[PDB]
Design a protein around this nucleic acid. Sequence first.
RNA 1: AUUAAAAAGGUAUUGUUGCCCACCAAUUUUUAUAAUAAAAAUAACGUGCAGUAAUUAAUAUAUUUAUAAAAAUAUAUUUUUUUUUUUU
RNA 2: UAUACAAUUAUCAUAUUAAAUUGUUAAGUGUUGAUUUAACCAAUAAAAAUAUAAAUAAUUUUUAUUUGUUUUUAAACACCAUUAGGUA
Lengths: 361, 42, 49, 110, 88, 55, 53, 24, 54, 159
Amino acid sequence: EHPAIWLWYPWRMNPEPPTPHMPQRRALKNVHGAVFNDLTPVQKKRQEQMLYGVNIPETRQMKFEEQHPLLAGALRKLEGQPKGFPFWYRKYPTRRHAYEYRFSIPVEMLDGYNDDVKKALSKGMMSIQEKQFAQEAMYMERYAEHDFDTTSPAVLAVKRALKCRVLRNHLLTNPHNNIIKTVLANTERKLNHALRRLRKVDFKKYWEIIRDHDVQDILQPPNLVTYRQGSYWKYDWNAGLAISTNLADVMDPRGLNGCVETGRSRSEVARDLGLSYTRPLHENEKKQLSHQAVYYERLAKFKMEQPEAARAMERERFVRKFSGMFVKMDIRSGAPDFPSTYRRLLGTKVVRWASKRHGPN
Amino acid sequence: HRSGKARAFVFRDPSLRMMRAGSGYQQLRRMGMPMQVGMGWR
Amino acid sequence: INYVPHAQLREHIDKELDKYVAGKNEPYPLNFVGQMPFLEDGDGNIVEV
Amino acid sequence: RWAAKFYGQVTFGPRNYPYPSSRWLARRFQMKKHRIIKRFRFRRYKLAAVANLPFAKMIRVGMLPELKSSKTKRGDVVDPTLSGQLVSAVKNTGEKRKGQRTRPKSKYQV
Amino acid sequence: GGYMMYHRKAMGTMKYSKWKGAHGGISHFYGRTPMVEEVRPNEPITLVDRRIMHYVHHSRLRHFQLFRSYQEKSNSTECKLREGEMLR
Amino acid sequence: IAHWYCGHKFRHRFMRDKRFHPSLQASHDARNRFSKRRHFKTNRWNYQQAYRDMP
Amino acid sequence: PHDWRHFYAQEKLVRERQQNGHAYGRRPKQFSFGARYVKTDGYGKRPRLPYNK
Amino acid sequence: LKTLDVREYRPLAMPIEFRFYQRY
Amino acid sequence: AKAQAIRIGLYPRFGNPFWFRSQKFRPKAYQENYDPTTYSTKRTVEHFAYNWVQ
Amino acid sequence: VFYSFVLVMKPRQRRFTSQALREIGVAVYSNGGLIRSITNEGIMRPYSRFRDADNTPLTYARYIILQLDMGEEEMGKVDKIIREHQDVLMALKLNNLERPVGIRSGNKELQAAYFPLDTFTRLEEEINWSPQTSADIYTQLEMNWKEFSRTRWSSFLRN
RNA sequence: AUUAAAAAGGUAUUGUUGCCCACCAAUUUUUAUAAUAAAAAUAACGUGCAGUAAUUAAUAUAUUUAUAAAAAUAUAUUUUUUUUUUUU
RNA sequence: UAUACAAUUAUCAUAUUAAAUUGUUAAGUGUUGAUUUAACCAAUAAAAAUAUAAAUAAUUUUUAUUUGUUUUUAAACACCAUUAGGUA
Ligand SMILES: [Mg+2]
Ligand SMILES: [Mg+2]
Ligand SMILES: [Mg+2]
Ligand SMILES: [Mg+2]
Ligand SMILES: [Mg+2]
Ligand SMILES: [Mg+2]
Ligand SMILES: [Mg+2]
Ligand SMILES: [Mg+2]
Ligand SMILES: [Mg+2]
Ligand SMILES: [Mg+2]
Ligand SMILES: [Mg+2]
Ligand SMILES: [Mg+2]
Ligand SMILES: [Mg+2]
Ligand SMILES: [Mg+2]
Ligand SMILES: [Mg+2]
Ligand SMILES: [Mg+2]
């Protein structure tokens, strides 16, 4: 009934627990303080798709056949027959690349052995840790720039995304291990770094990672204060990606620059070259502008068709100009910020304003 | 004395004390850094 | 390695369960704890100690 | 924790004194802490901090007109609804309901 | 109330008290028996006993058992005593 | 140190100077230097579903 | 043993860095003679790391 | 606390760790 | 090992069932030989005694 | 091995032992796993009396060794299946068989860094030695080494 | 015809007939007035005997208890005095 | 009244690169009774054992997360009160 009440008997070290009692099991926060009760349907889908099994994409078989047609030719002669020479080694450049069977055993190496052995090295026989490593290797391979790429942004972002999902559902099961709460939070932070570097490296991959693994919640700026000071945007300055755009493929640079000798802004030289840069507008700005564009037509119609009403309003304005506070424009009257430049009047003489600052300055 | 000021083990080299003072307020006033926005001395 | 398939199960279980049948002409194998355990006849009653 | 671990500076010894506190000093401050705590117990102090209120400012419930120990001093002025709710809280804190977690009880809590 | 076997009050003899477990032959102590000695023919059991007891005492087992089986002590005093012992 | 500024002790002066120290200044990492503790545990029981407009 | 305090310190430090550099001198809550088998599903049946509480 | 010393106690020992704490 | 063995019933909860058999494996040290490295202060003085008496 | 069990069982009439083992085996097959070896041992006298489902303490018990290849997910199911069976007194489980204690400690492995496939191929018997093993197997081992290494490729490259 | 030596602590300072600890009156003074406000000066009266390994060692946190120092229990710990199996 | 901390090592309260979390085992009856305690009083007494590897280093978690208080005695010990119970 109405706000919680902490009761503290001051001889005791701490208060008694509150009356409404709170939820019996503590909520699980993400790094920023937002609450997740359970995995989102997307992430859930990712783990259900990890659990039952992963697969190597036939993409790799394809590029293997187009790049090294000889080796693939050999393997194409030899199917089903036991091989003493591993022709397939180009298909699996790294230890990590072969996830379809345990212990990094490539598929075509199982040709001459027992079917029992084949079942014993299968996916179904993996531990859970092995399965995670499998999903990670598959995704790392799909976003990697070359075979041995690890440290690049896309790869990093993906592996950290996966690690994060794993830890999350883990915490869902067994509530208190705060070691892993902390490791989840740190992972989430390093993921935040990786993603914010991605969108300034290549943004479409950034997008499709967010859409695959459903992490938009760690890209949300933490709080209004530090955002208003532009320290959220200040990150990609520190990362050194701020100037990295390479415009010319997008955004023809001719109308982004101002004229040094003329003094005219970028909107001006854009005006002159007959170009329009304008961000897509929401309904706010559209209906404001479309309301403002028409002022003069409405006015012309008004003063043509209805002169008496107009003359009334004008009487009021004209006569107003003689009444009022200041009749003429001087430094005192023409002070853009009146309460600010005269603060010394605000309590006593001037009663209009109750505060000295209504704006940035 | 856990509650009290930290003391140096030895003195400080005076020469270094004078070397770290190069950009100090007096030298700045001599360089002319602060804007003169008021009447100042008569 | 000889993997016991589902087809061979009860046959293999019986081969292993008759391992000590309380008479043979050949010397008996020990345990994993290296003991000579009790010899049961058919149906697993303990005949010889 | 809410309350204070210590009262006054309990570790004052010379630098590199290889313990947090000496016996002497810690005994002095144990005395002062003892007196304060005993005062809290006998006067039957009660504090509260309510949600959606400034927290640093704690309503002192031990001074409330219903729960006030003294017959003389004017206690305090707290909102009628809020004070009713505080009284109900203090009252229903007292005894152990089974299935609830056992919490330490005392004479001076009532 | 229920006591452990090394407890003070463990095997009580009273009108209410009754000993617990199979007490003879194959017994309550079946796999719990710390020492076993087959008595050599024509050997008094006093040599046997004094051998066992010397053994336990010199290796500080009887120390330990006497110690822990009488009173409770917090893990701090136990640590303090054991590490003190070991440093001495 | 003139004795009238800040508290009656000396160390109060240096405790308010730590408020102006250059390498101690408030930024995106170190925030709410002056009252950290009034804002502590403030949102614990405030449940906010994070913002996702992308799948 | 107190003469060797520095030694023990080195060990406490270790158990702290395992805990994310937090609980110094902290140890697991002693549970009960049979905490594991007297507790229902959903409650901790074995003593956790102190930071894990 | 009592603002004065109830006991007149002067230890004469000067352990090198207490005095120079910059080096020990 | 001792843990597992115990819960499987292959080792007793107290006692050493192989105690006598194992004595071959332990270095039982005869009072008649002298190991120059011992923390035994008795053995040293015993051999000192012996030689002096010789 | 991937997994192993030691199963201490009540010494019943043979038809019952066979039914129970068929139940455990079928419980392993249904869950999509394999049996490397199901080894039988005799009715032994343990160091601890076990009580059965009748709460009647037992002096003797039949020992049975399981060696399985499963997923770690669905061996939870097989675990609480085995432990909940009425003819099993006790079951101890070894999961350490893929990385046992004596490997991968400060580059103890020469010419490889943690080759996992060494101990997977093997059965439990050669990872953990039984007491009867003597210096004699040091002989047999090598006749089974050399011999093997002679016939392997020739046997494999046949088909 | 039935022997002794060698390791040890002081809040005192010619040192236990040494010092000290709280409540219990007067007063003095500052204030952020909780049974009977808080804190600091203080030299009465009356209880005791809390502390100086100090008559069940002390110290810190926690919880309880109460003429008054304080006491009981749960943890850590020595600014407490030490007693010492390299497979028996 | 004004009139110059440290920056090589400083113990009470502003944490931060971390691998954990999860395991269903044990124990119980023969019979006529002075056990425990320095000493009292209530009054069946036996007991709850297994896990390493792996997790990469730093750069915007400080309104987030985190430092021995915990359902179930129809289960005990232990502790508190004293035969009535509390707690565990
Ligand atoms: Mg302005
Ligand atoms: Mg004013
Ligand atoms: Mg206390
Ligand atoms: Mg009872
Ligand atoms: Mg003095
Ligand atoms: Mg002295
Ligand atoms: Mg006054
Ligand atoms: Mg007063
Ligand atoms: Mg005394
Ligand atoms: Mg005392
Ligand atoms: Mg005392
Ligand atoms: Mg104390
Ligand atoms: Mg008292
Ligand atoms: Mg106390
Ligand atoms: Mg601090
Ligand atoms: Mg309870």
